[PDB]
Amino acid sequence: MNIFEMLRIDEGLRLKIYKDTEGYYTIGIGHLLTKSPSLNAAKSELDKAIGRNTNGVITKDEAEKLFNQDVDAAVRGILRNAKLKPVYDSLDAVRRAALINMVFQMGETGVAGFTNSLRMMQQKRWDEAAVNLAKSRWYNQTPNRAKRVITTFRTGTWDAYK
């Protein structure tokens, strides 16, 4: 298991524009296109992202290409984030993948707001962090996925994904 397989499990793969769990237009492997209500705006962002007139459909390859960019960007976002980097640096490889998953889902900003959880993780107080992480809208809205990520932080293993 690795970050790519992990997120491919959490996000799925869809080749036609779709609405995510928040009702936003997305495509591929969890690639958000727009928070706007307009399908056109979404088709427009899509074309600009792929570089061709897609008509709201992309191939597997294109989906994977967006995915690789998005994973790269999440990592690079963490490394540039003063609140995030130090956490990330302190973690083992498995747990870093959990932090990346969160950032990919919610954005660097979103994650950087979990101040208390972050400190707990930095301190390696796993059970406590797990409990604090669960007191969030993130957990209440997407509980099955949140449980997977939380177990990952708690145990430092990939069990939740097997």
**Which residues belong to the active site?**
11, 20
Residues in contact with Cl ion, total (CB under 5 A)?
4
Cβ 113 to Cl ion, closest distance in Å? Answer: 20
CB-wise, 105 or 132, nearer to Cl ion?
105
Task: Confirm or deny that 4 is annotated as ligand binding.
Answer: no
151 touches Cl ion by CB under 5 A: no
For the chain, report the end-to-end CA distance as a whole number of angstroms. Answer: 9
150 touches Cl ion by CB under 5 A: no
Task: Confirm or deny that 99 is annotated as ligand binding.
Answer: no
CB-wise, 70 or 87, nearer to Cl ion?
70
Tell me, residue by residue from 25 to 54, as one string, x for binding to Cl ion by CB under 5 A and - for no binding: ------------------------x-----
142 touches Cl ion by CB under 5 A: yes
Q: Which residues are annotated as a binding site for substrate?
A: 32, 104, 117, 132
Residues that bind Cl ion (CB under 5 A): 49, 142, 144-145
